[PDB]
């Protein structure tokens, strides 16, 4: 089993000399196929000048990852890893690695070239390789971005602008990052506008409805660990069809946000090549 690509565009030797440096890469493929166009390669087919982040990962979640192997005349010899076997995956480069790190895929967010970014353009077309990042950096950058979708609604406060100035600088082993602002041109992204409502809606409905369901379980007794919780539910203080539809309006907002939460690992770091030019990893997913 090997997956092939074809370049209908002519390949200048200067571009294939950068392409040979990609002995391996975590190239997404939307649909597994015996043969596929280069237009299907990368996240560039999903590129949007509007939605930005979140939609890039909600479409990336279904992508079939595949490593690069070898290159021939106007064609790529991609090879799909088997689960559990070791593979010499290339890094996307933002973060230096050390032994034992977890890894997971994230949408690209360039801040100039990354440590491993030889640009390759074939007439308007461009290849945006997905991030391979340690898991704690992914959960933290997701928290910073959802927090950016909260505070961006009211930019004007100097304490808030200093707040965004403080949270913008994530750090790691000799890292010096600066978080991109999703909310370009003042107006909120539609993805930030939806992801924030996905949590804030439950933040209101759970606060209003939590009493009625703990109520019937309060008179019942067992370990009675639940009965005490309502005393702190009271600290921050009637229709039938409204009670019906409202719960259906609850989980529909809760559920798509779970993709923003859970993030299955795809690789794990072991031995590290010098200057982090490559790293062996155990494929997963």
């Amino acid at each position: 089993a090997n997956i092939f690509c074809t370049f209908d565009h002519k390949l200048s030797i200067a571009d294939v000399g950068k392409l040979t440096k990609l002995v391996a890469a975590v190239v997404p493929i939307p649909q597994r196929l015996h043969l596929i166009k280069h237009y299907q390669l990368g996240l560039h087919q999903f590129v949007d000048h509007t939605r930005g982040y979140v939609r890039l990962r909600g479409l990336l979640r279904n992508m079939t990852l595949t490593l690069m192997r070898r290159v021939e005349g106007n064609q790529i010899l991609l090879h799909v890893p088997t689960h559990g076997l070791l593979y010499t995956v290339l890094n996307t480069g933002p973060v230096t690695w050390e032994k034992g790190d977890a890894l997971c895929v994230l949408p690209p967010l360039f801040h100039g070239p990354l440590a491993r970014e030889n640009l390759l353009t074939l007439g308007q077309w461009e290849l945006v390789l997905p991030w391979i990042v340690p898991m704690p950096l992914a959960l933290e950058i997701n928290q910073r971005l959802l927090i950016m979708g909260l505070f961006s609604l009211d930019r004007s406060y100097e304490e808030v602008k200093a707040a965004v100035q403080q949270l913008q600088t994530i750090t790691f082993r000799d890292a010096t990052f600066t978080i991109p602002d999703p909310v370009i041109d003042q107006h909120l992204l539609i993805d930030m506008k939806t992801a924030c409502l996905s949590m804030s809606m439950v933040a209101n409905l759970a606060s209003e409805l939590t009493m009625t369901y703990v109520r019937k379980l309060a008179l019942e007794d067992s370990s009675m660990l639940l009965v005490k919780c309502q005393e702190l539910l009271m600290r921050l203080d009637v229709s039938p069809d409204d009670e019906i539809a409202r719960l259906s309006a609850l989980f529909v907002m809760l559920r798509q946000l779970d993709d923003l939460i859970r993030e299955q690992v795809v690789f794990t770091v072991c031995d590290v090549s010098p200057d982090n030019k490559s790293a062996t990893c155990i494929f997963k997913g």
């Binding site: 370990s223 660990l225 005490k228 919780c229 005393e231 702190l232």
Partner: protein, 48 residues
């Protein structure tokens, strides 16, 4: 107590479904599930 002293539990079980393994964990750690509420009753600072 104010100074947490976490426990460590290696354990073998024939269970292979995480959705049920959390359920059998629900009633066994009743003091611990009570403890997660027991920090909110005292110290809103520092997230449990």
């Amino acid at each position: 107590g104010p100074e947490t002293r976490p426990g460590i539990y290696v354990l073998t079980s024939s269970i292979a479904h995480w959705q049920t393994l959390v359920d059998v964990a629900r009633g066994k750690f009743a003091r611990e599930r009570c403890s997660f509420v027991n920090r909110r009753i005292t110290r809103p600072r520092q997230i449990p």
